[PDB]
Design an enzyme around this catalytic site. Structure first.
Site, PDB file in Angstrom:
ATOM      1  N   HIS A  65      11.111  -2.953 -13.071  1.00  0.00           N
ATOM      2  CA  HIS A  65      11.114  -3.985 -12.039  1.00  0.00           C
ATOM      3  C   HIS A  65      10.133  -5.088 -12.383  1.00  0.00           C
ATOM      4  O   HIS A  65       9.041  -4.859 -12.925  1.00  0.00           O
ATOM      5  CB  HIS A  65      10.745  -3.321 -10.705  1.00  0.00           C
ATOM      6  N   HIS A  67       7.999  -7.473 -10.704  1.00  0.00           N
ATOM      7  CA  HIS A  67       7.425  -7.466  -9.356  1.00  0.00           C
ATOM      8  C   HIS A  67       7.144  -8.872  -8.856  1.00  0.00           C
ATOM      9  O   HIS A  67       6.365  -9.610  -9.443  1.00  0.00           O
ATOM     10  CB  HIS A  67       6.131  -6.641  -9.377  1.00  0.00           C
ATOM     11  N   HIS A 110       6.767  -3.202 -14.136  1.00  0.00           N
ATOM     12  CA  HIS A 110       6.425  -1.803 -14.120  1.00  0.00           C
ATOM     13  C   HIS A 110       7.665  -0.958 -14.044  1.00  0.00           C
ATOM     14  O   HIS A 110       8.695  -1.361 -13.504  1.00  0.00           O
ATOM     15  CB  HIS A 110       5.441  -1.471 -12.961  1.00  0.00           C
ATOM     16  N   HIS A 112      10.111   1.543 -12.409  1.00  0.00           N
ATOM     17  CA  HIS A 112      10.468   1.748 -11.017  1.00  0.00           C
ATOM     18  C   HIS A 112      11.372   2.967 -10.898  1.00  0.00           C
ATOM     19  O   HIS A 112      12.321   2.977 -10.116  1.00  0.00           O
ATOM     20  CB  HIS A 112      11.071   0.481 -10.387  1.00  0.00           C
ATOM     21  N   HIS A 397      -2.342   1.290   3.479  1.00  0.00           N
ATOM     22  CA  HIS A 397      -1.101   1.229   2.709  1.00  0.00           C
ATOM     23  C   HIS A 397      -0.725  -0.215   2.384  1.00  0.00           C
ATOM     24  O   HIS A 397      -0.538  -1.015   3.310  1.00  0.00           O
ATOM     25  CB  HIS A 397       0.056   1.859   3.498  1.00  0.00           C
ATOM     26  N   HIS A 400       5.092  -3.643   0.334  1.00  0.00           N
ATOM     27  CA  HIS A 400       5.681  -4.645  -0.534  1.00  0.00           C
ATOM     28  C   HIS A 400       7.167  -4.722  -0.282  1.00  0.00           C
ATOM     29  O   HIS A 400       7.842  -3.708  -0.099  1.00  0.00           O
ATOM     30  CB  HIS A 400       5.418  -4.247  -1.986  1.00  0.00           C
ATOM     31  N   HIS A 402      10.684  -6.332  -1.979  1.00  0.00           N
ATOM     32  CA  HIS A 402      11.382  -6.965  -3.085  1.00  0.00           C
ATOM     33  C   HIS A 402      12.207  -8.185  -2.579  1.00  0.00           C
ATOM     34  O   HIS A 402      12.568  -8.260  -1.418  1.00  0.00           O
ATOM     35  CB  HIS A 402      12.360  -5.976  -3.736  1.00  0.00           C
ATOM     36  N   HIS A 452       8.544  -0.917   0.653  1.00  0.00           N
ATOM     37  CA  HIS A 452       7.872   0.356   0.468  1.00  0.00           C
ATOM     38  C   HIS A 452       6.389   0.167   0.339  1.00  0.00           C
ATOM     39  O   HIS A 452       5.887  -0.891  -0.027  1.00  0.00           O
ATOM     40  CB  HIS A 452       8.435   1.076  -0.778  1.00  0.00           C
ATOM     41  N   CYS A 453       5.656   1.268   0.579  1.00  0.00           N
ATOM     42  CA  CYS A 453       4.248   1.311   0.210  1.00  0.00           C
ATOM     43  C   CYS A 453       4.156   1.303  -1.318  1.00  0.00           C
ATOM     44  O   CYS A 453       4.906   2.014  -1.993  1.00  0.00           O
ATOM     45  CB  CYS A 453       3.611   2.579   0.756  1.00  0.00           C
ATOM     46  N   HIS A 454       3.231   0.511  -1.863  1.00  0.00           N
ATOM     47  CA  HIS A 454       3.062   0.406  -3.299  1.00  0.00           C
ATOM     48  C   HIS A 454       2.036   1.370  -3.868  1.00  0.00           C
ATOM     49  O   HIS A 454       1.739   1.323  -5.054  1.00  0.00           O
ATOM     50  CB  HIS A 454       2.768  -1.044  -3.728  1.00  0.00           C
ATOM     51  N   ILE A 455       1.522   2.292  -3.040  1.00  0.00           N
ATOM     52  CA  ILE A 455       0.842   3.482  -3.586  1.00  0.00           C
ATOM     53  C   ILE A 455       1.979   4.368  -4.086  1.00  0.00           C
ATOM     54  O   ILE A 455       2.795   4.868  -3.292  1.00  0.00           O
ATOM     55  CB  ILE A 455      -0.052   4.154  -2.533  1.00  0.00           C
ATOM     56  N   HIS A 458       2.939   7.639  -2.677  1.00  0.00           N
ATOM     57  CA  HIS A 458       3.511   7.566  -1.330  1.00  0.00           C
ATOM     58  C   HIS A 458       4.986   7.172  -1.357  1.00  0.00           C
ATOM     59  O   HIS A 458       5.783   7.714  -0.606  1.00  0.00           O
ATOM     60  CB  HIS A 458       2.701   6.592  -0.443  1.00  0.00           C
ATOM     61  N   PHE A 463       7.957   6.932   1.343  1.00  0.00           N
ATOM     62  CA  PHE A 463       7.478   5.840   2.237  1.00  0.00           C
ATOM     63  C   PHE A 463       8.204   4.521   1.911  1.00  0.00           C
ATOM     64  O   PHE A 463       7.617   3.586   1.360  1.00  0.00           O
ATOM     65  CB  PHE A 463       5.970   5.714   2.146  1.00  0.00           C
TER      66      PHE A 463
HETATM   67 CU   LIG Z   1       0.834   4.336   1.166  1.00  0.00          CU
HETATM   68 CU   LIG Z   2       5.612  -3.696  -7.987  1.00  0.00          CU
HETATM   69 CU   LIG Z   3       8.626  -5.635  -6.197  1.00  0.00          CU
HETATM   70 CU   LIG Z   4       9.497  -1.477  -5.336  1.00  0.00          CU
HETATM   71  F   LIG Z   5       9.092  -7.377  -6.051  1.00  0.00           F
END
Ligand SMILES: [Cu+2]
Ligand SMILES: [Cu+2]
Ligand SMILES: [Cu+2]
Ligand SMILES: [Cu+2]
Ligand SMILES: [F-]
Ligand SMILES: *[C@@H]1O[C@H](CO)[C@@H](O[C@@H]2O[C@H](CO)[C@@H](O[C@@H]3O[C@H](CO)[C@@H](O)[C@H](O)[C@@H]3O)[C@H](O)[C@H]2NC(C)=O)[C@H](O)[C@H]1NC(C)=O
Ligand SMILES: *[C@@H]1O[C@H](CO)[C@@H](O[C@@H]2O[C@H](CO)[C@@H](O)[C@H](O)[C@H]2NC(C)=O)[C@H](O)[C@H]1NC(C)=O
Length: 497
Positions: A65, A67, A110, A112, A397, A400, A402, A452-455, A458, A463
């Site tokens: 992905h 980001h 990164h 995904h 948290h 993020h 997309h 989603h949470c980007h941790i 998680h 999440f």
């Molecule tokens: Cu989280």
């Molecule tokens: Cu990302």
């Molecule tokens: Cu993204």
């Molecule tokens: Cu994502």
């Molecule tokens: F993104």
């Protein structure tokens, strides 16, 4: 040594020792972090990703992905596994062919798929602006001014035991740093500046989990960009940066020629700087090659507070200036229990058929889409508001979205919304218990967009939801190449699905 906008990118397994401890990794371009992918605003990126992975302990499939890049008309190139594509299998390649109209700033790429980016597949992605409105604020902006902050684990991501707490073993700044336990005096990163010059430092969190308190002894930092969005100048002496966020800041090399500590304190893992953990070195040309002797203050004078940021352009806020003042106002119930996260009572588990492919095959409401209850339709050409009240364990948290950036109408730790001039960004901390961080955007980008949470731990534990934006126009808006259509049959054959 930047690559792109047209480039091959090989994904391999190799041993690395960024903190003096050797482990196998998943790497783009043979390095951790991966090489910078770069181009100019509006360019056509053609990133042919070669999956050469052979070690199943970190998964031999992959998907990448880009980001923060909106992917308008190219949802199939966005990268989240089982949302927009099936993974690329080993021994195959796939051309992510997309354009970046209307965007310029600091991004990253990164894996995904699962928690694979934690195993090493992460790198910077910079879209320069030949007519940058901030150009006159600095002298130098190139690969030497990118600063990545990364968490690094000795245990492989797939091998993190069920029911044990996950924390990192080192903070890596530009790929180097020292381990929190069994610390050895492995090399630290050096960022070099020339006395009198001004630098556009592009600070990128490529974290799988922790937020960092980032500072530079003796110096302050003038923020000019937030997650791709140009900002008014905001001078701070510390930046709390959450997973996946980016800032550009002007660094004025205006202190005596010398060595200064660069600090990145994670919110978990090792606390402090003993033995040079959590550290890098800012070295002026002509300084002695030796460690800094500087210290941090006990209390920072001007920490970043998100409500202090404002767009450089007149971006405003869509909708009406009150809670629920949108065409489609949402409030998500974000929860954690028993090892799983949920959104409105549903824990995300990736589907067998990617959401995009389900839509292209004719599924035409979100109730028809799998996973059931995890896909929420958004109407076209509409103002969306999403309130994200905090409280779920494991926070804060960083959520993020997309396909979009968004106005941050309400930020962490402050109950007052801003319907006038809040910053826009793509990843936002939802704060602490009782907070009501709220985002707004307009739906002008048909396709399924992950929220989603980007941790990453998680995300893996559920999440997330998918916003199926403008289902009716998704197929016409996003024509797909044959190679994309080939992905799922190849993946399912390889995995006996
Ligand atoms: Cu989280
Ligand atoms: Cu990302
Ligand atoms: Cu993204
Ligand atoms: Cu994502
Ligand atoms: F993104
Ligand atoms: C909590 O968040 C709110 C909302 O983002 C922050 O409120 C905003 O504070 C700024 C700075 O004081 C206000 O702007 C100022 O407006 C005055 C006019 O009174 C102008 O003279 C100044 O130059 C400055 O631009 C802004 O109106 C205000 N917005 C709202 C909706 O209240 C607040 O500062 C945050 N709290 C903390 C402790 O940071
Ligand atoms: C966060 O803000 C949202 C609105 O953006 C609040 O949502 C309202 O919640 C109450 C029940 O708590 C409902 O009766 C309303 O219909 C909701 N929408 C409104 C008023 O616009 C939500 O309560 C807030 N959450 C927290 C924790 O402060």
């Amino acid at each position: 040594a930047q690559i792109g906008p047209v480039t091959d990118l090989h994904i391999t397994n190799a041993n690395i020792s960024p903190d003096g401890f050797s482990r196998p990794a998943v790497l783009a371009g043979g390095t951790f972090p991966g090489p910078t992918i770069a181009g100019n605003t509006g360019d056509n990126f053609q990133i042919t990703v070669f999956n050469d992975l052979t070690d199943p302990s970190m998964l031999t499939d992959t998907s990448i992905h880009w980001h923060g890049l909106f992917q308008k008309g190219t949802n199939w190139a966005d990268g989240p596994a089982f949302v927009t594509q099936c993974p690329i299998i080993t021994g195959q390649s796939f051309d992510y062919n997309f354009n970046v109209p209307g965007q310029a700033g600091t991004f990253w790429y990164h894996s995904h798929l699962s928690t694979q980016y934690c195993d090493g597949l992460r790198g910077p992605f910079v879209v320069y602006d030949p007519n940058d409105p901030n150009a006159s604020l600095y002298d130098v902006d190139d690969d030497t001014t990118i600063i990545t902050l990364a968490d690094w684990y000795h245990t492989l991501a797939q091998q993190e035991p069920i029911g044990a707490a996950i924390t990192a073993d080192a903070t890596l700044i530009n790929g180097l740093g020292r381990s929190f336990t069994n610390t050895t005096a492995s090399p630290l990163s050096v960022i070099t500046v020339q006395s009198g010059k001004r630098y556009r430092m592009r600070l990128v969190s490529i974290s799988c989990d922790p937020n960092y308190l980032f500072s530079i002894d003796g110096h302050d930092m003038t923020i000019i960009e937030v997650d791709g969005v140009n900002s008014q100048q905001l001078t701070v002496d510390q930046i709390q940066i959450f997973a996946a966020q980016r800032y550009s800041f002007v660094l004025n090399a205006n202190q005596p020629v010398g060595n200064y500590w660069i600090r990145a304190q994670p919110n978990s893992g090792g606390q402090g700087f003993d033995g040079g953990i959590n550290s890098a070195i800012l070295r002026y040309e002509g300084a002695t090659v030796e460690d800094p002797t500087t210290t941090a203050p006990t209390t920072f004078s001007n920490p970043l507070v998100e409500t202090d940021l404002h767009p450089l352009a007149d971006l405003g806020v869509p909708g009406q200036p009150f809670r629920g003042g949108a065409d489609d106002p949402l409030v998500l119930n974000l929860a954690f229990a028993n090892g799983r996260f949920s959104i409105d009572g549903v824990s995300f588990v990736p589907p067998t058929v990617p959401v995009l492919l389900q839509i292209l095959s004719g599924a035409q409401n979100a109730q028809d889409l799998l996973p059931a209850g995890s896909v929420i339709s958004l109407p076209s050409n509409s103002v969306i508001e999403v309130a994200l009240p905090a409280g779920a364990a494991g926070g804060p948290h960083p959520f993020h979205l997309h396909g979009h950036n968004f106005a941050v109408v309400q930020s962490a730790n402050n109950a007052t919304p801003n319907y006038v001039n809040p910053i826009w960004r793509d990843t936002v901390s939802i704060g602490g218990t009782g907070d009501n961080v709220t985002i707004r955007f307009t739906t002008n980008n048909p396709g399924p967009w992950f929220l989603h949470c980007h941790i990453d731990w998680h995300l893996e534990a559920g999440f997330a939801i998918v916003f199926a934006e403008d289902i009716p126009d998704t197929a016409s808006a996003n024509p797909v190449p044959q190679a994309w259509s080939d992905l799922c049959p190849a993946y399912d054959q390889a995995h006996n699905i």
